[PDB]
Amino acid sequence: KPHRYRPGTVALREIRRYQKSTELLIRKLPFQRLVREIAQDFKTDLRFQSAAIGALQEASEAYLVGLFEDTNLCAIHAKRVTIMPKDIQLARRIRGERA
Amino acid sequence: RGSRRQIQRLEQLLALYVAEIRRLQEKELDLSELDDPDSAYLQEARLKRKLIRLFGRLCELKDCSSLTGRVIEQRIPYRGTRYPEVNRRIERLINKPGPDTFPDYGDVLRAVEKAAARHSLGLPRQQLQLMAQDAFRDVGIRLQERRHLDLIYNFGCHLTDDYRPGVDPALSDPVLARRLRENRSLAMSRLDEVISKYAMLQDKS
Amino acid sequence: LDTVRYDYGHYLIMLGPFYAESSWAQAAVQTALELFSALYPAPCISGYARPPGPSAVIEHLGSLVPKGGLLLFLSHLPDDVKDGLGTGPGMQQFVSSYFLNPACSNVFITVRQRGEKINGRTVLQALGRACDMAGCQHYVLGSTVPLGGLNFVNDLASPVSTAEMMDDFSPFFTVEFPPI
Amino acid sequence: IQGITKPAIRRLARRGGVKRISGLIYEETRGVLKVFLENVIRDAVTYTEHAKRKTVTAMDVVYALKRQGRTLYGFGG
């Protein structure tokens, strides 16, 4: 239990959200461009808040890890077997919905 | 103490980075701004990283070791067998550092047969595997909702922050409710047919 | 009272003890508050709520919160209730027995602590001193948070810091609020 | 046409407690990702233009996320 730091000028929950955001896996240009692809897709042309791209990324990876969590949570094996859409569809069959 | 005078300039610099991070978080982007590698979004991410490592500099500057307030950090203790030193080896799944510490069934079985072997338990592969399955699903779930929890804790920014659940506009204007029931229909339809798409596709094997 | 906006991450405090008897304690809480506005004159209270009254504690706590919910600690409960702990959600039931039904002479406040030590005092500390001098008991129960309605964390083992109450903590024994 | 990293996906997978994966699972996650975003934005925009606005808001996206079933469950009560 070594010492810990709380700064005076910044609320922690802000610093924890910033550190949370720097943690995201996918690179942010690829993402930004995938939202472009879906917007130019939808024929809707609206400016997006950058705050809203933020929300979309945080939530997307939430969902994806959520699906791998779901798929590994039903794996009973004799040794490691590599994971296939068989397995994801079975995991989803058992639990479902989101993450 | 003339140095203690300098450390607060670093702290308010932190305050400044957060000022500009919110100024960028508000800036709105059309589509061509969304192809931009220099866009207000990516600027906001460059700023967030420069902040967090200023913070880290500063943490290692006060001896205080770098970490901040997350449920990820606390080791999650587990005694779910009736056998406490199986839970010795098992309880440090987590002792492995940071995120990405999360097992599959194989790992739990290796740790339960580790604590079976070197502690010399000697119980059949039967109830050994009951212990391994019960435990794996139990801590799988506990860990999952611990992560989810950390998500609803720190999510979005000061903009998403102010959200009441019952000012949802769909409530007073049922035309909107109509449209949204429609979109959710579409959404679930698609999810399930894409998952089954790659199922019945990988059947090509 | 001066007000400031309600955002997540403030502190929840309760001012009071644990006509007639309720008339004495009253004179103290409102006294301490005044003293506070004097001792620390910068507008940090977001969400004072008494109303309507007299009403069951959790209902008092209901009108305190516009968004999200609260997370409070078992060590920072009043020693009268804290003592009845020394067994899972079995104890959720008891802490409901003490903090749900009983009707309060107490005042619940949410104060925001933002930098800016005044004189010697912090927010929590100027409320500490103004409270003691005013002859008034005060418990800092926990902090205001995005998740859940009412969330208790098991604090009994190690206490939380006066200051370290804003961290994440993952509760057991979660309690939904009331209706209107 | 360039995608998103085969390692980044092997890394989301690894985060889910998954070691290695069938090849085609790579592109499955791509597909799944894109479906998700679609019907979040679809819902977000539905708000945005109902309220008659030229910009999609981080609030619009919260209102959409919480509508996605379990996804944001627990937030803001």
Residue numbers in the entry:
A (entry chain A): 37 to 135
B (entry chain C): 182 to 386
C (entry chain D): 383 to 400, 413 to 480, 488 to 581
D (entry chain B): 26 to 102
Article excerpt on this structure:
On the basis of earlier findings by our groups and others revealing the structure of the ternary complex of the HBD of chaperone DAXX bound to the histone H3.3-H4 dimer, and biochemical evidence for quaternary complex formation between this ternary complex and the DID of BNRF1, we had successfully reconstituted and crystallized the quaternary complex of the BNRF1 DID (fragment 381–599) with the chaperone DAXX HBD and H3.3-H4 dimer. The structure of the quaternary complex shows that the BNRF1 DID folds into a globular α/β domain and is positioned on top of the DAXX HBD—H3.3-H4 complex with X-ray structural statistics listed in Table 1 and a portion of the electron density map shown in Supplementary Fig. 1a. BNRF1 DID has seven anti-parallel β-strands (β1 to β7) forming a β-sheet core fold, which is further surrounded on both sides by five α-helices (α1–α5). A DALI search involving the fold of the BNRF1 DID alone based on the quaternary complex revealed that the overall fold is highly similar to the structure of the B-lobe of the first PurM-like domain of the Salmonella typhimurium FGARAT (StFGARAT or StPurL) protein23, with an r.m.s.d. of 2.1 Å. It is also apparent that there are extensive local differences spread throughout the entire BNRF1 DID fold, especially in that the BNRF1 DID has an unique and extremely long loop (L12 loop connecting β6 and β7), which is important for binding to DAXX HBD—H3.3-H4 (see below). The DAXX HBD—H3.3-H4 portion of the structure of the quaternary BNRF1 DID—DAXX HBD—H3.3-H4 complex, is similar to our previous structure of the ternary DAXX HBD—H3.3-H4 complex, with small local differences in the binding interface for BNRF1 DID and with a small r.m.s.d. of 0.7 Å. The BNRF1 DID uses four loops (L1, L5, L11 and L12) to capture the chaperone DAXX HBD—H3.3-H4 complex through contacts to each component of this complex. A single-residue Tyr390 from L1 loop and three residues, Pro460, Lys461 and Gly462 from L5 loop of BNRF1 DID interact with the residues Asp342, Asp343, Tyr344 and Arg345 in the loop between α5 and α6 of DAXX HBD, with the Arg49 of H3.3 and with the H4 C-terminal tail.
DAXX (death-domain associated protein-6) is a histone H3.3 chaperone that functions with the co-chaperone ATRX (ATP-dependent chromatin remodeller α-thalassaemia X-linked mental retardation protein) to assemble repressive heterochromatin at GC-rich repetitive elements, such as telomeres, pericentromeric regions and endogenous retrotransposons. BNRF1 is an EBV-encoded tegument protein that is essential for transcription of viral genes during the earliest stages of viral infection. BNRF1 is a member of a family of proteins with homology to the FGARAT enzyme involved in the de novo purine nucleotide biosynthesis. We now report the structural basis of how BNRF1 interacts with DAXX in a stable quaternary complex with histones H3.3 and H4.
